[PDB]
Symmetry: C3
Subunit: 262 residues, 3 copies
């Protein structure tokens, strides 16, 4: 629990350009770990905000025409500022609109972490038309998808699922913490993207240990919240998750973390 | 509890074009019953999304110029795709801006359910019990009508039913009624003329869950009620449903 | 607890033009005290809504080009309707974009209450004839001739010939996004269409909110910022005069 202590003490300003369903929950989850969220979407204030921020999250869950040019512009402003970007290509596999936009974004800017579920990351890389020799209709595992994506974008890849996978440089790790109740809370994965942004501390090429810790804090909090005697389902789980992020300590972290290399 | 079982197993993709105050809660409510919510507002992806979706909710609670043309366009896309529309004309009686828009929408697309409170549905058909209003509206639009109130009324074809479940705490949670629109969408399974039994089950699941949540020892008011509602939707079983449902045919 | 009884009985329509992170919580908080929130942002319906509303909140937390001109237009519609405006210049000190906009709004329209933290209000008054919150609030009052509410560890209100300091609340409030945003809404709920509100209304609004927060954080089921938020809403819903009078902490009153 190294980096979480620093979040709690430093209160990193974490800019979130995220979807309209999850803004409150993402901001609350960032506040619970001690970060300082700001949902700023105006390009007119990006240069000022970004100079003093520690990371930017771009999540395209409710992407519309209102957002497209602005997201590209701020991504470029983040690059120029040296502000690391976490990119969550929500539902990219569901439409050509989203596929085209994500391709455009990742041709326009260097991001620092790309985070999605297996189907999202597979759709990204399938659309690239680069993966000569790979059958995409075959049942590719998340580790394989993550390493292929890493080869394409040379950017840390985080694939969420029953087990989570992180690939950064030549290290790949698999994490096995969490709760099924997380899929039953709409902001959960989207919040994770914001939590990962919270752990970056302005590092454009984050250490894999930061990413391991971000994902593990979230998932272990979830596991603990779901065990709480007052957790009665996905509704009461959400407040308990935030409480459990707020209170998570090193002892619980170390006792619960389930990680495997390769 | 027939249709709920199907939602739980089949995880129906339910598209929601809804208001800015209730997106999260609507999504969460749909997740608690097993549905798969998607708050897609871009007309550019409607054709692709709608081909695989089971229903569309259109709720105009926070209608602005940004939304107007897009809502008309997606309603037409839904019609073309055979995707049933649930329409919630939130606060239509409060402004000529809303009244004009709702009139334009209902001249531009066939919807599958129109849901509102008595004043909303009255405003639609005007510009007085709920049963009478609902039947008049049904005559005009030839679409299922759900009027929420102390008692809820459903009219579909030549059948009208009154349901008497719920809690007073629902009125103190913003977007309770908005979420009920989404739950109704979740029960449609791509039927553009839904069975009245599906509509009865959608409203009853919601209002029985509300009743039961408000009886929970840990319900201390409208704040704690909302998490408990979601828990209760997640846990609702047939035994509770059948013991608690209060329905009368008109 | 005079005004709160009235809000519970009369159910004042309270229009909120507020930021995207806090809409749901703001509406729920207004519902909890018995107000009727409406998050109407369309200028096309402002004249009709405002004739029957009791107040308007304008909060610029998520200000973008989409909002700028609409906010100016609706503020003018409110002024023409006699509808009091509560203005929350969220993070105005953080960008020239927000500073310039707040300067434009306040030139264009008269508001009834300006609510912010000390850094926000200080940023508003920064380019003027020219440290503690009371001093900042009095300077702002001299410039805008409008009630000023400065939130902080202790809250300050200045209106008319009086300045007061209040000392209620919980540290868990800072860990709930939009607690302060919801407070702006609660203040709007206490206005009852008075464009020059009585300081007693403002004191009651802030005190109801912060006393509820204190009480909710003492609840045995409050385990952190997540469970606190539901309990805050429950405690606003149930707050009574006895608790109010026993807990209110008014620290200083000047003039
Ligand atoms: C976290 C945030 N970003 C924009 C507005 N908000 C809520 C007020 O802090
Ligand atoms: C339910 C929904 N629609 C667009 C975004 N979201 C939140 C979860 O991705
Ligand atoms: C509170 C409000 N303003 C616009 C929509 N909503 C939520 C449904 O009442
Ligand atoms: Mg996701
Ligand atoms: Mg309605
Ligand atoms: Mg609805
Ligand atoms: Mg504030």
């Amino acid at each position: 629990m190294n980096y979480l202590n620093n979040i709690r003490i430093e209160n990193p300003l974490t800019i979130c350009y995220t979807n309209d369903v999850v803004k409150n929950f993402t901001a609350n989850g960032l506040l619970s770990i001690g970060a300082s969220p700001a949902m700023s979407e105006a390009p007119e204030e990006a240069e000022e905000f970004y100079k003093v921020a520690q990371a930017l999250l771009i999540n395209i869950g409710t992407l519309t025409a209102q957002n497209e040019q602005d997201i590209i512009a701020i991504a470029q402003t983040a690059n120029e500022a040296g502000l690391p970007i976490v990119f969550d290509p929500v539902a990219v596999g569901a439409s050509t609109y989203r596929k085209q936009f994500c391709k455009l974004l990742l041709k326009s800017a260097k991001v620092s972490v790309i985070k999605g579920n297996a189907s999202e990351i597979l759709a990204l890389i399938d659309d690239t038309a680069t993966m000569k020799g790979t059958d995409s209709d075959a049942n590719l595992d998340a580790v394989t998808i993550a390493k292929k994506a890493y080869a394409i974008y040379k950017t840390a890849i985080v694939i969420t699922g029953k087990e989570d996978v992180i690939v950064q440089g030549d290290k790949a790790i698999v994490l096995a913490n969490g709760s099924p109740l997380l899929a039953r809370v709409t902001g959960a994965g989207c919040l994770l993207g914001g939590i990962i942004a919270g752990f970056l501390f302005r590092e454009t090429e984050p250490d894999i240990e930061a990413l391991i810790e971000a994902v593990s804090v979230f998932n272990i909090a979830a596991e603990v919240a779901a065990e709480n005697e007052n957790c009665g389902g996905p509704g009461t789980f959400s407040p308990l998750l935030l409480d459990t992020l707020y209170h998570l300590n090193e002892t619980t972290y170390q006792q619960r973390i389930r990680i495997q290399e390769v």
